Amino acid sequence: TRDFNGTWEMESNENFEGYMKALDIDFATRKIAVRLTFTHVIDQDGDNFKTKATSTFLNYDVDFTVGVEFDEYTKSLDNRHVKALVTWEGDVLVCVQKGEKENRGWKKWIEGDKLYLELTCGDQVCRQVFKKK
Numbered sequence: 001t002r003d004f005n006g007t008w009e010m011e012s013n014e015n016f017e018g019y020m021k022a023l024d025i026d027f028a029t030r031k032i033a034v035r036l037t038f039t040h041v042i043d044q045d046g047d048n049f050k051t052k053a054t055s056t057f058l059n060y061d062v063d064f065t066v067g068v069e070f071d072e073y074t075k076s077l078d079n080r081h082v083k084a085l086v087t088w089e090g091d092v093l094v095c096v097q098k099g100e101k102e103n104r105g106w107k108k109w110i111e112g113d114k115l116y117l118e119l120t121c122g123d124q125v126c127r128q129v130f131k132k133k
């Protein structure tokens, strides 16, 4: 499926710390973030994505149109300017964030009832799994 719609509840989160250190997330935010359960809400209509990630203390919202490059400010993450582009590779949703950090981006894909997220920055890879709620 290429349909990522739904409310997704975190089930596994491997090496979030190394990914966040690659981004120069400060020690403080890192320790809080590594313990929190995240809910990821995706409202997808054609190419148009409205996405949310909510926790009891840290939140991240981004909207994008597949295939349309956009300048992004990674507000309350590492607060950097990147040139973002989200495209399809088969049924994998792939984002490249061009900027100062190397190999920065993410990939989303679904297997069965699970959403998989791979976050990359530098030589670090974080893998998260969500169960559809």
Ligand SMILES: *C/C=C/c1ccc2c(c1)C(C)(C)c1cc(N(CC)CC)ccc1-2
Residues within 6 Å of the ligand: 020, 025, 029, 033, 038, 053, 058, 059, 060, 076, 077, 078, 106, 108, 117, 119
């Ligand atoms: C499709 C979503 C991809 C994606 C890329 C980067 C991040 C995330 C999802 C989050 C919301 C899981 C997330 C959280 C953080 N935190 C550390 C500052 C917690 C707010 C950083 C980057 C990403």
